[PDB]
Amino acid sequence: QQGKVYETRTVKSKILGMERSYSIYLPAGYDEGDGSYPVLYLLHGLGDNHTGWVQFGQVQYIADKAIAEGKSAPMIIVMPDADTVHKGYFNLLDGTYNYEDFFFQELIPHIEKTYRVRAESRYRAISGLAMGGGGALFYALHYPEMFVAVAPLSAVGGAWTFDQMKNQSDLSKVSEEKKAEVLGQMDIQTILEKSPKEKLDRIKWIRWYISCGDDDFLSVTNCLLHNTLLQHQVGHEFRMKDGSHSWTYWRMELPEVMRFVSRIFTQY
Amino acid sequence: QQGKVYETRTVKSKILGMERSYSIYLPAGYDEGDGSYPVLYLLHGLGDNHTGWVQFGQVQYIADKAIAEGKSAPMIIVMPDADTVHKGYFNLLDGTYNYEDFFFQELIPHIEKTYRVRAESRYRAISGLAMGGGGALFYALHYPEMFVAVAPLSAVGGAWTFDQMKNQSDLSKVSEEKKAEVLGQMDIQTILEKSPKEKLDRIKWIRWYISCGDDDFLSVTNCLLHNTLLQHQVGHEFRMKDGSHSWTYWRMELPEVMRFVSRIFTQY
Amino acid sequence: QQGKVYETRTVKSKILGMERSYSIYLPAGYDEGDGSYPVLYLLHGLGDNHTGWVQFGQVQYIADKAIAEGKSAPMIIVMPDADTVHKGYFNLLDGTYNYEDFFFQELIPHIEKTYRVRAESRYRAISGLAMGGGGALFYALHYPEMFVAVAPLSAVGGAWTFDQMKNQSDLSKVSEEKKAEVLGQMDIQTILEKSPKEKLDRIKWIRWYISCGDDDFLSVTNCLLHNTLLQHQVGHEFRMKDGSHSWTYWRMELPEVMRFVSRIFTQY
Amino acid sequence: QQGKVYETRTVKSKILGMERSYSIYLPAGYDEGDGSYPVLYLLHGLGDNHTGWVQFGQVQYIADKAIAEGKSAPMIIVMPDADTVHKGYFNLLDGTYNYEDFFFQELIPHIEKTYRVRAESRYRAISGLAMGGGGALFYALHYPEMFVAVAPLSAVGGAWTFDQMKNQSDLSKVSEEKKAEVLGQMDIQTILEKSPKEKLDRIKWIRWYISCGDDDFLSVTNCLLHNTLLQHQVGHEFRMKDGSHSWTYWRMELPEVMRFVSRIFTQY
Amino acid sequence: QQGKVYETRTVKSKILGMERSYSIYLPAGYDEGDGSYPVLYLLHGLGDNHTGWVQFGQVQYIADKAIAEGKSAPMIIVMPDADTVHKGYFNLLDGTYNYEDFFFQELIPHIEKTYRVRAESRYRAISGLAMGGGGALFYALHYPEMFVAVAPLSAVGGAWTFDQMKNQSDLSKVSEEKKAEVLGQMDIQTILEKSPKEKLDRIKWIRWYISCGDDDFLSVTNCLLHNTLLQHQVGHEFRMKDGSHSWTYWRMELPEVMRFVSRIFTQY
Amino acid sequence: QQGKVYETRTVKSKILGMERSYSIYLPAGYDEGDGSYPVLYLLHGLGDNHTGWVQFGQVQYIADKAIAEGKSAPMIIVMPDADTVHKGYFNLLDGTYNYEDFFFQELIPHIEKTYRVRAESRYRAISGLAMGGGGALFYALHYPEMFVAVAPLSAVGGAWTFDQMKNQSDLSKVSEEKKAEVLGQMDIQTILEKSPKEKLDRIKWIRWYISCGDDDFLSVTNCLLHNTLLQHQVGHEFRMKDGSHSWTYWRMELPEVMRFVSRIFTQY
Amino acid sequence: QQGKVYETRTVKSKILGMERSYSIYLPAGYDEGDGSYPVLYLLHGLGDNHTGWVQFGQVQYIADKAIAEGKSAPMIIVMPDADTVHKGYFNLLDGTYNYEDFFFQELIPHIEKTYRVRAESRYRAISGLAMGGGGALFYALHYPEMFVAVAPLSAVGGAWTFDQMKNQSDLSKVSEEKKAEVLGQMDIQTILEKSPKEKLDRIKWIRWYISCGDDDFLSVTNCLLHNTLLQHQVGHEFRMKDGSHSWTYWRMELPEVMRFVSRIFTQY
Ligand SMILES: COC(=O)/C=C/c1ccc(O)c(OC)c1
Ligand SMILES: COC(=O)/C=C/c1ccc(O)c(OC)c1
Ligand SMILES: COC(=O)/C=C/c1ccc(O)c(OC)c1
Ligand SMILES: COC(=O)/C=C/c1ccc(O)c(OC)c1
Ligand SMILES: COC(=O)/C=C/c1ccc(O)c(OC)c1
Ligand SMILES: [Ca+2]
Ligand SMILES: [Ca+2]
Ligand SMILES: [Ca+2]
Ligand SMILES: [Ca+2]
Ligand SMILES: [Ca+2]
Ligand SMILES: [Ca+2]
Ligand SMILES: [Ca+2]
């Protein structure tokens, strides 16, 4: 019936020079047997931290329920802290805080070393809300070879995030050529035009689930996102449901995301 | 428990010079008591006729169920034939087939004279799928004072419809001034910009429900519609659900449209 | 299991010099057997008429459901039109439109003459919403011998009602002496203080059910009403539920009202 | 699915010079994982002590049920003893028994030190019945920066509370200037008029839930409370349900209070 | 809601020189409204007549139940008599009894003239068991333009059906050159090999549903049927379920057959 | 009531010269009491290994559910790895990898030594999908005295398996005489033709359950298999259901397989 | 969900000079937390002992069920042995066996010292069947200050009990003065007539629940009991249900008795 959540553990980070918090959900029966589990990475929005999906998202109750009902297979859920010191998911322009490198080169290997994890792309999915939707969306466009499924909920656009990366950086130390380079790497249109054939095929191979409420100011951002993906022939599932920019929407979508990624993990 | 459907009745049209077919759904208890009912106009798509919402849409079973369960209050459903002679809902460019004039000046008054109908805008709503979604959309943008609720399902765009009016017309007799004028009356951007305040207020006061499946080729048209409406401050409900250009989608949506318009008929 | 509604029947009034509309709900089985039924008079709000409880209140579906479930015993529901010519339930101050006289001397005797009605006080109740809630409240305070139960929903106060009576009157024909007298007859504090013992006792014998939503602008009016009745030792049931000034509130309250008066008609 | 209750633990009070009893409810799964929880302070009425909400309120069964069904998120419930030595929640006028200082400077820090509590305003709510309803009400009017939600049930008034503080004080040592000072601090009208703008805004930011039975002698006090709050534009949810001054009323409201505060803890 | 069955009606047949019996199931509500219905032709097995699907198949109960639950749309079910005079569905080789001619030239037009039928191939399906399963299959391979859906249940093969045609014939009147041709028209391998592209494509457009129990002596014939169709790229739905050559098997498949054809009639 | 899965335990093979992986499912309550269990050996398909039925087949959830509902009696499920070094279940022709000998002489004795197993043929069954369906089928045809029930799901044929033995072997060291010898040992027709009466009788005593989806490319293989068994009077259960070569099909059949073998273990 | 029963524990009795057996039901969760519980003393009938309510009454299942459903709050149930040495609940007339004194001075204090019991009259109730109905009835009439609720089931009368006390005694050492005094102390009419105002008011404060089946030989005794209590204005609930002198009756009443006493323990 019931799994458990740890909120106070950390990963020793040399790239960020600190102990980084994360939360982790372990499914019921993680402590019995010796088997391993797939992992869902679940990213919070602006203002919250690694307790957001725990306290507001009610991840323990919602995942316990979905797994016991058979709506989802057992999985591990990992919730990073992207609020302490700097807010956001990407490497800053001044070179002083490379959070994206921390995620792929330190957090993911730590999870695989510490917990009983199936450590392959086919067992790794990523999702998030608002700021974390943009995080999940662009993590997968940068490293499509790391994920099998991606689920941006109420996702911010590339322009919003690049604005956050500039406001968070010391712009006196950043040249104009470097601003132009990262601006292009945070634009969904430019990434798809400039991707080599191998990259674009991995992007088409990823299973995408993109959802947003219709009374959300981000509905326009996500309708433009849907049109861009069809224009580049990236098949995906797209939902615009009754809802707003609120935790009512995200607690309702969480079991849908789990059912979506769980079927990819188990195949069908 | 059970209402009834008549498929074979006609209305004698002076504008079109012929008897025009329609099907009509009367709710259960229509023959008991003396009260009157609100009306939903339900328009078919390209290739089908007045039997379309009857045979494919299964209107009798679905409305019988929604009304018996209380999801919808009792109402009349009218399904006009827009297939015979010429296909489409609008006046052709050559002046030989003014179907839109027929709808508003002959069909609606005939229904209100023949059946026990509450003959007011506050009790009159319109919906349709594909070609009929574009019909419901542009019928309401032309005569916004005529409806309280409008529900385009998988609706075609204005450019698609204007192309249909050209194909069906004798363009040898049509001047370039008329071609340019009618295109502007079939463009939603243009109508909203050229409307006086009294007209634009009535368009915002209409309660809109716009729904389309994500695996439909029209999903892009309807996402662009959602953006255009927001840009002009037309509040509306927008849904993009899992589904395609098929009768599974429209039979799923029919009881939603009925609950949507029923709450407006009864207030809430 | 389905009853029926007549909307188009009238009653010939000498007091008002015209045919006055009413609506009537007859329970299932009215046309089999020869028995008689109690009556609930159900009053609409300002701007609406005798169709209001039919179309907005959905009286037919709600009454059919409550009687078939046994939540209520079978009863007749009468819905008078207090909208045509003048809006309101009371005698105008200029003497040209004595609606309250019509209600008690012509409508109530007519209903008892035309339909199979148990014509005693113990089988007659009155209820209404907003304007009609104030109507029901003061109809019973003026003629307490006429009802066994009274249920004001979201009721306006006497001050609101008196103000509305003046606007509809030709105040050139009205003396200040009559204005002060009528003001006192539309004030609950005055009526309870100035009633002889015989009248005040009948007021206490009536079973009162007073309900209003907390997000209603009339919530303060109805809280003051609860305090006044307690201050004069008039027992009543009082409900302030989650809700607003809406037909969602009043369609919810109709089955509670029907269970309330039904239990009094049948005893317990 | 079962949590647990501790009744026999105490807090060592420097202010009251004794070990002070409290009861605490820990939710299911409190022992597994390392996370923290929000806290609801739940105050008993006159005559009961820290065992009242346990034995009469049946907090363990009711909270176990609401949390397992998902009607509430997991929370900690703390039940202070306000009966031993003196009955009541406030500082006595003679200076020998400052229970209110005890509550805020000793009990709240003790809970946050001893249990895994999210120790912020946004994760702290307070509720109580009768005497404790007034206690919850005026604790929050005195220290509004401490709470995010307040739920007085069948609450006693400000005058009743000030009367208790006097009967419980030795008045020979009490000056007349102080009596008038505390009289004003235990009056809601006085507090709302005389609070500076920063306090008054914080009172409006709190989420209020006020409930009382219609057959309670205190129904008048709480209806006057409803009117006073609207007069000062402090929005709140107000309920007057069928019920009396009884543990039937309070056992029914306990899960409604839990759902109310839980939605505030989790956001929506 | 119950439909009805007529057993005793006949069609006056010039080809067979007699009145031919049939049974017909008309759905609930056939006698209200004026609409039309699709038709399922339902063929009995050897030894039975037009009462077989009525008395043994229990078509009234099964069709009333499937239609009311919404598992199937309303349809007409026609059950021809192929037992009187001679047993079988095909023209006997001696030219004296052209039952296949009777079915397509007299029975189908008579049903369409007498009942409210949608008279098009897109609204016409055929099914049967054993002898009638072979009948449905070879009717559709001979006249593929007549059906949209075909459902042989526990069908006999072409050789068994041809052998029955010989044994019932007067061989004094049979030419051997025609006998050899008809043997080839009653062999599925031969029909598909000899079909021109227009015929072969129409056969692939028909929707096939082939079902047979695994404990049936005919399971081998129907597995070979499945192998032949795939060898010729005729996509179809094939079911081998637990069951025998019995009315337990056929009563279970009848609602499955109805759901299969209903969705094709209504589209999806 | 939850059982448990072990994935990381091995068996020391003298025949294969390495530690060989397997997974094992132990039912709930295996750790209470001293009783013994029957065993189902469950073989994966090509490309997966011993975690395939665990991660994709979800054996833990599906077996936990079937046993708790009583659809199946408690049993042990053993899932061997036939992927490492060489893919497949049979002895290679070059003599370097005799996997079939390993299975019967090392793996089965190890399970019976290590876990509480009823070590008799009447308590031993075998099943699998695709490559593993052929494994189960030909494992049972070679040593039929080892199993009481066999369940090939979507099984490959013997020719498919013989092709795998050739492609996986170094054929330079293999004589033509040996190629002909094993070819005959991997053909179902040949095995049944040459079996002595004792072997043939035990094959008929085995209870066979053969299931395949109709939209699977292997459906022709299994229809031919059904025909072959009937020609040799090998009674069996045969199912052809709606489905493809997918884990939806195989997760659906696993509880059907468990119910089938459980009923044989317990008798009926 | 499940509590537990101890049958083999004993109280060391100075009054009876021996270890006395009792059985005890502890509710689920007794071993978690530190809280205390109310106590129901539950007395057996003639012939049974402290195992009677356990084996025949099935108290463990019935109390587990009533408490888990919330029909009763958790309580401790103590079942004393009144069978060993002498049968009955009262002091023998010869002074050699003061069973009633043992009950009040040794059994009740031992329970409160040994288990976590709320040791006040308001948390103490008594019930019993047959002989134990008379015991519970007359214990409460003798020591009314000890109980808050009393529930005699199918109770014997005082005359029967006094007959039991004599037959169990050595009457040669008992004077006629003691015989007459005890007869009056075991008669319900006499106890109520001679009780001072302090005792009679506590008798009226106790909540009584007296139940007996209609086909029971004691139905007449308990009808007279109902008559006696009413004549002295002792309010009580009285039930005469279908049933006999059997454990079907007493197993039916046990959850009613638990609900009755629970609501007194919790208030309502
Ligand atoms: C319009 O785009 C934006 O302004 C993005 C908001 C934003 C940007 C950087 C931050 O560090 C931050 O944290 C408070 C918020
Ligand atoms: C881009 O717009 C189009 O494709 C027009 C399709 C079309 C238009 C008019 C018709 O009468 C019609 O009938 C078959 C089809
Ligand atoms: C109207 O105000 C009142 O009556 C105050 C009642 C009261 C006050 C203090 C107490 O310690 C107490 O103990 C029983 C009762
Ligand atoms: C005729 O069927 C075939 O070709 C069998 C496919 C096959 C055979 C052996 C393998 O080791 C293998 O590895 C991926 C695949
Ligand atoms: C009918 O009157 C009676 O018999 C009194 C019952 C009774 C009395 C004393 C006993 O020791 C006893 O144990 C069997 C039963
Ligand atoms: Ca899709
Ligand atoms: Ca909305
Ligand atoms: Ca509100
Ligand atoms: Ca009341
Ligand atoms: Ca079988
Ligand atoms: Ca298929
Ligand atoms: Ca009886």
Binding residue ranges of C for Ca(2+): 214-215, 237, 242
User: How far does the centroid of ligand 3 lie from the alpha carbon of residue D164, in Å?
Assistant: 5
What DSSP line would sit under C195-211, residue for residue? --HHHHHHHHHSEEEEE
Residues contacting residue E176 through CB under 8 Å, at least 6 positions apart: none
Q: How many CA atoms lie within 13 A of F40 on its CB side?
A: 33
CB spacing of B214 vs A242 below 8 angstroms: no
Atom of ligand 2 nearest to the CA of B168: 11
The bound ligand whose nearest atom lies closest to the alpha carbon of F48 is 4
Nearest by CB to E32, from B4, B55, B246: name it.
B4
Which of D52, D60, D237, D67 has the alpha carbon at shortest distance from D152? D237
Nearest by CB to B240, from A220, A230, A240: name it.
A240
CB spacing of A220 vs B230 below 8 angstroms: yes
Residues contacting residue B209 through CB under 8 Å, at least 6 positions apart: B127, B149, B150, B151, B152, B236, B237, B239, B256, B257, B260
F214 assigned to a ligand binding site: yes
The angle at the Cα of C95, spanning C92 to C100, to the nearest 5 degrees, equals 50
Residues surrounding ion ligand 7 at CB below 5 Å: A 215, 242
Residue type, B19: E
Backbone angles phi, psi at E207, to 5 degrees: -95, 120
User: How far does the centroid of ligand 1 lie from the alpha carbon of residue A131, in Å?
Assistant: 10
B215 assigned to a ligand binding site: yes
F49: left (phi over 0), alpha (psi -120 to 50) or beta: beta
Backbone angles phi, psi at A227, to 5 degrees: -65, -40
Q: Chain D: residue nearest A57 by CA? A: D266
Residues contacting residue E143 through CB under 8 Å, at least 6 positions apart: E104
Burial annotation A144-163 (CB, 10 A radius, 16+ → b, else e): bebbbbbbbbbbbbbebbbe
- Beta bridge partners of residue G153, listed in sequence order: G129, G211
Residue C9: alpha-carbon gap to chain centroid:
20
Strand segments, DSSP code E, in G118-161 are 124-129, 149-153
Task: Identify all chain B residues contacting C129, using CB atoms and an 8 Å cutoff.
Answer: none
Residues contacting residue E209 through CB under 8 Å, at least 6 positions apart: E149, E150, E151, E236, E237, E239, E256, E257, E260
Strands A76-80 and D207-213 turn out to be: unpaired
Residue type, C213: G
Q: What is the DSSP letter of A201?
A: H
Burial annotation F17-29 (CB, 10 A radius, 16+ → b, else e): eeebbbbbbbbee
Residue A210 in contact with residue A155, Cβ under 8 Å? yes
Separation CA C148–CA C124 (nearest Å): 6
Among protein residues, the one whose CA lies closest to atom 8 of ligand 2? B164
**CA-based nearest distance B154→chain C, Å:** 30
- Residues belonging to chain E with any Cβ–Cβ distance to chain B shorter than 8 Å: 1, 28-29, 32-36, 38, 70, 73-74, 118, 123, 265-268
**CA-based nearest distance D166→chain C, Å:** 28
Among protein residues, the one whose CA lies closest to atom 4 of ligand 4? F163
Task: Identify all chain E residues contacting F238, using CB atoms and an 8 Å cutoff.
Answer: 214, 219, 240
Q: What is the DSSP letter of B215?
A: T
Binding residue ranges of G for Ca(2+): 214-215, 237, 242
Among protein residues, the one whose CA lies closest to atom 2 of ligand 1? A160
Residue type, B199: K
Q: Determine whether the shortest distance from the Cβ of D231 to ligand 3 is under 6 A.
A: no
Residue B44 in contact with residue B83, Cβ under 8 Å? yes
Among protein residues, the one whose CA lies closest to atom 1 of ligand 3? D160
Residue E125 in contact with residue E139, Cβ under 8 Å? no
CB spacing of E227 vs F214 below 8 angstroms: no
Among protein residues, the one whose CA lies closest to atom 6 of ligand 1? A164
Name residues contacting ligand 4 (CB within 6 A): F 46, 87, 160, 163-164, 167-168
E strand or H helix at D125? strand D124-129
Q: Chain F: residue nearest E230 by CA? A: F220
Separation CA F199–CA F202 (nearest Å): 5
A48 assigned to a ligand binding site: no
Q: Can you tell me whether residue B97 is helix, strand or coil? A: coil
Name residues contacting ligand 1 (CB within 6 A): A 46, 87, 160, 163-164, 167-168
Separation CA D125–CA A19 (nearest Å): 32
Separation CA E119–CA E109 (nearest Å): 9
CB spacing of G73 vs D58 below 8 angstroms: yes
**CA-based nearest distance C84→chain B, Å:** 18
Residue B49 in contact with residue B84, Cβ under 8 Å? yes
* C to D CB pairs, distance under 8 Å: 43
**CA-based nearest distance A44→chain F, Å:** 28
Burial annotation D196-234 (CB, 10 A radius, 16+ → b, else e): eeebbebbbebbbbbbbbbbbebbbbbbbbbbebbeeeb
Q: Determine whether the shortest distance from the Cβ of D168 to ligand 3 is under 6 A.
A: yes
Among protein residues, the one whose CA lies closest to atom 12 of ligand 4? F164
Task: Identify all chain D residues contacting A60, using CB atoms and an 8 Å cutoff.
Answer: 29
Burial annotation G202-235 (CB, 10 A radius, 16+ → b, else e): bbeebbbbbbbbeebebbebbeebeeebeeeebe
Residues contacting residue F38 through CB under 8 Å, at least 6 positions apart: F73, F75, F76, F117, F118, F123, F124, F125, F261, F265
Separation CA A60–CA B104 (nearest Å): 57
The angle at the Cα of C49, spanning C47 to C53, to the nearest 5 degrees, equals 110
CB spacing of B35 vs C2 below 8 angstroms: no
User: How far does the centroid of ligand 5 lie from the alpha carbon of residue G246, in Å?
Assistant: 18
Which of G114, G106, G118 has the alpha carbon at shortest distance from G80? G106
What DSSP line would sit under A122-143, residue for residue? GGEEEEEETHHHHHHHHHHHH-
Separation CA B135–CA B127 (nearest Å): 8
For this entry, resolution in Å reads 2.7
* A to B CB pairs, distance under 8 Å: 43
End-to-end CA distance of chain B: 25
Chains with ≥3 CB–CB distances under 8 Å to B: A, C, E
Q: What is the DSSP letter of E172?
A: G
Separation CA C228–CA C189 (nearest Å): 7
Backbone angles phi, psi at E152, to 5 degrees: -75, 125
Q: Give the determination technique.
A: X-ray
Residue type, D209: Y
Q: Determine whether the shortest distance from the Cβ of B160 to ligand 2 is under 6 A.
A: yes
Residue F70, classified by CB atoms within 10 Å of its CB into exposed (0-12), middle (13-18) or buried (19+), is exposed
Separation CA F150–CA E266 (nearest Å): 43
Tally of CB atoms within 10 A around E60: 17
Separation CA D80–CA B75 (nearest Å): 58
Q: Determine whether the shortest distance from the Cβ of G85 to ligand 5 is under 6 A.
A: no
Burial annotation G46-70 (CB, 10 A radius, 16+ → b, else e): bebbbbbbbebbbbbebbbebbbee
Tally of CB atoms within 10 A around G135: 30
Q: Can you tell me whether residue G143 is helix, strand or coil? A: coil
User: How far does the centroid of ligand 11 lie from the alpha carbon of residue D243, in Å?
Assistant: 61
Among protein residues, the one whose CA lies closest to atom 12 of ligand 5? G164
- Beta bridge partners of residue C21, listed in sequence order: C10
